[PDB]
Amino acid sequence: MPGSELISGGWFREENDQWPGQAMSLRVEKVLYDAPTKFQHLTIFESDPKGPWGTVMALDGCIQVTDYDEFVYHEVLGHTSLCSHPKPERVLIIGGGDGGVLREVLRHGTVEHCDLVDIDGEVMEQSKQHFPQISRSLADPRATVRVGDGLAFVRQTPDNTYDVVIIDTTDPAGPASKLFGEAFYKDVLRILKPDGICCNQGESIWLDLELIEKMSRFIRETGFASVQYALMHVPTYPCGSIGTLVCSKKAGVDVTKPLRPVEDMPFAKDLKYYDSEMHKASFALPRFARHINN
Amino acid sequence: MPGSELISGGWFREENDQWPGQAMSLRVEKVLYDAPTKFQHLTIFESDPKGPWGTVMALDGCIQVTDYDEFVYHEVLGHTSLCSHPKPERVLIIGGGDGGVLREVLRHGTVEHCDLVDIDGEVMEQSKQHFPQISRSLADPRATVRVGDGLAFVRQTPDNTYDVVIIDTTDPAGPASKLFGEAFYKDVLRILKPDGICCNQGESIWLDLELIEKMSRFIRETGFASVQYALMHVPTYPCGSIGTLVCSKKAGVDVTKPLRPVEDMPFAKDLKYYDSEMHKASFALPRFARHINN
Ligand SMILES: C[S@@H](CCCN)C[C@H]1O[C@@H](n2cnc3c(N)ncnc32)[C@H](O)[C@@H]1O
Ligand SMILES: C[S@@H](CCCN)C[C@H]1O[C@@H](n2cnc3c(N)ncnc32)[C@H](O)[C@@H]1O
Ligand SMILES: NCCc1ccccc1F
Ligand SMILES: NCCc1ccccc1F
C-alpha cells in the first residue's frame, strides 16, 4: 500500500497500519530508485552521510535492509538454521531476493546447492545495482535463483528435497500474505527431509505477539516436532527487533544449543553479530513472551 | 538543545544530534506538559490510542519512558544489580526521578532504605501526575527522595555507605554530562561498601560504542574489579535498545550469572521482562560489541 509519499521533507517516514502510531524515520540524502514493480513498491535511497545507515531499501513502505545493520538478520537466519542441522547440503530460500541470507548460507562448506525463489525479480536486480555486498552471492554456481511465487514453488517440489528451508519474506500485507498461513507450512514440512530445519521471518514480540502464538501453534500442529522463537536486535525493523521461528521436523532436537557450532568453521571470525553465545541467548525471551518457547 | 519544536504535523519526532540522521516518531493525541524546568525541557504527551505506547515522556527531546515498555529498563537495572549482590540493604539511585527503578528495588525484601537524588524536581512531580504506575514508589517510607545534582550528592556522601548505586541518568548532553565522567565514578566507588555493585544508563552499542568502551576502561582504572555490559530490548530508546554497565567493587564477582536468583523471591512472577534466563542472556553481546565484556 504505502509508496513514494513516505518520502517528504528530506525524510523517509515508515508509517504503516501494521504499526499504527509510530514511524521510524531516516533522513534522505539522495533517492536512487523509486518505482512500482510488478508486485510491490520499491524505494532505495542513500541516507544522511552524517548518520551510519548508508543505503536503505523499502518494499511497500517497509524498511527491508540498510547497509549498517543488515548483517544481523542475515547472519541469524543463515547460521541459526544451518548450525542446528547435522549436515545441511540442500537449502531452500523463499523470498531473500536481496541475497543476504544466501550469502550467509553459502559460507557453510556442507552446502552443495541452494534454491532461491523470490516473487519480485526487480528486488534481485536493484540489490545487484545498489547493494553489492549483500547481493554478490546471487551469482554463485551453488545457487539457482528463480523469479516466482514461493507457494507455487513448494507445491511443485518433491517430498524430502531440502535439509533447510528459510522463509525470508516481507510482512503479511502484500504478496507474502499466504506464506504466513498453515497450508504453506504444511508443504514446507513435506519438502523437508526427516532431519530438516525451517526458519522464517517471524515478526515482532512487541507488535505481533498474537500472530507469533498462532503460527508457533499451527506449525507444531502441522507436524513439526518443535518450534522456538529466536529474538535479534535490528534497529531498522519496527521496534528494533525481529525474530525467527526455528522449527525441527525431527523429534528430540534442541535447536537452542548449536549442533554444529560456527566456531569450528573457518569463517566464524568474519561474522559481525552471530556466534554460539548469541545463538543460545536469542532463545531467552522477555517474561511476557517466554511462553512461545516454554 | 531541542524543545517544543519536535512536535509537528501531529507527531513527536525524536530528532537529535546525538543520533544524526534518524528519529523515532510517535503520533501525539494530546500534549499533557510542555515547558522548560529549572534544568531541562520536559514534554509529556498521550500517544495514539490506536497504538500501544500510552503516555510518553521526553527530556531535552529524548524519550525517557512510555507506558508500554517502561518495565524493561526498570526491571533490568533494579534486578540485575540487586540479584548480583549478596544482601543489598542500602541502595542509592542517582537520577531516576520517575521512580521506576525505585519501584523495582523496593520489591526486594532485603532493602532497608533507598535514597534517590534527581536534579529536576519537576520530573518527580509530573511522573506522579501522569505516570502513577511508574511513580507509585516515590513516597514509600523506605525511600528518601531529594532534589539535587547527583555529582554533589555522591561527593558529600561518606565512604562505605551503600550496597548498590544505580545511576539512572539522561544522555550526556545536558545536566547528566559529568555523571558519564571519571571523577563521578571515583566517588561512586568510594561510597560503595566493599562488596558493592553499581550500574548505570550505559547507552547504545549502535551509537555509542566508543563511549561505552571508554567508560568501561575508566571505571576499571578507578578501582572497580569488574565491569560487564548488559543489553536489553527497549523499542522507544534510540535504535531499540540500551545497556547498563554492571560493576563490582570486589574482585571475584561474576555479575553475569545471578548470585541470588529472582525465582527464589516471591515477586518473580510479577515481572514482565526480567528473569534469570534474561539476566544471563543480557550479557551475550553481538561480535562487534564483544570487546566491551571480553
Ligand atoms: C527483501 S527480502 C527481506 C529483507 C531481508 N533479507 C523479502 C522478500 O520476500 C519476497 N516475497 C514476498 N512475497 C513472496 C512470495 N509469495 N514468494 C516469494 N517471495 C516473496 C519479496 O519480494 C522480498 O524480496
Ligand atoms: C527520567 S530518568 C530516565 C528515564 C528512565 N527511568 C533520568 C533522570 O536523570 C536526571 N538527571 C540528569 N542529570 C542529573 C544530575 N546531574 N543529577 C541527578 N539527576 C540527574 C534527570 O533529571 C532525569 O529525571
Ligand atoms: N517490518 C519488517 C519485517 C521484516 C523483517 C525481515 C525481513 C523482511 C521483513 F519484511
Ligand atoms: N536516549 C535515551 C537514553 C536513556 C536511556 C534510559 C534512561 C534515560 C535515558 F536518557
Question: How many beta-strand segments of chain A?
Answer: 13
CATH-assigned fold name of the largest domain in chain A: Rossmann fold
**What is the level 1 CATH name of the largest domain in chain A?**
Alpha Beta
Largest interface: A-B, 45 and 42 residues
Shape of chain A: globular
Structural class by SSE content of chain A: alpha/beta
What distance lies between the first and last C-alpha atoms of chain A, to the nearest angstrom?
A: 36 Å
Protein name (chains A, B): Spermidine synthase, putative
Binding site for S-adenosyl-L-methionine 1 (chains A, B): 40, 118, 149-150, 169
Enzyme class (chains A, B): transferase
EC number (chains A, B): 2.5.1.16
Question: Can you offer a commentary on this structure?
Answer:
Two copies of one chain form a homodimer. In chain A, a hairpin with an 8-residue loop joins strand 2 and strand 3. The termini of chain A are far apart. In chain A, strands 9-8-7-10-11-13-12 form a seven-stranded mixed sheet, sandwiched between helices. In chain A, strands 1-2-3-4-5-6 form a six-stranded antiparallel sheet. The radius of gyration of chain A is 18 Å and the shape is globular. Chain A has helices spanning 70-82, 100-105, 121-130, 132-135, 150-155, 182-191, 209-222, 276-282, and strands spanning 7-8, 11-13, 22-36, 41-47, 55-59, 62-66, 90-95, 113-118, 143-147, 162-168, 192-200, 226-233, 241-248. Chain A is α/β, with parallel strands linked by helices and 294 residues long. Chain A folds into two domains: 1-68, Spermidine Synthase, Chain: A, domain 2; 69-294, Vaccinia Virus protein VP39 (Rossmann fold, 3-Layer(aba) Sandwich). At the A-B interface, strand 3 and helix 8 of A face strand 3 and helix 8 of B. The site of one ligand S4M has 24 residues of chain B, from strand 6, strand 7, strand 8 and helix 5. Chains A, B: One of its GO terms (molecular function) is spermidine synthase activity. Chains A, B: Residues 9-249 form the PABS domain.
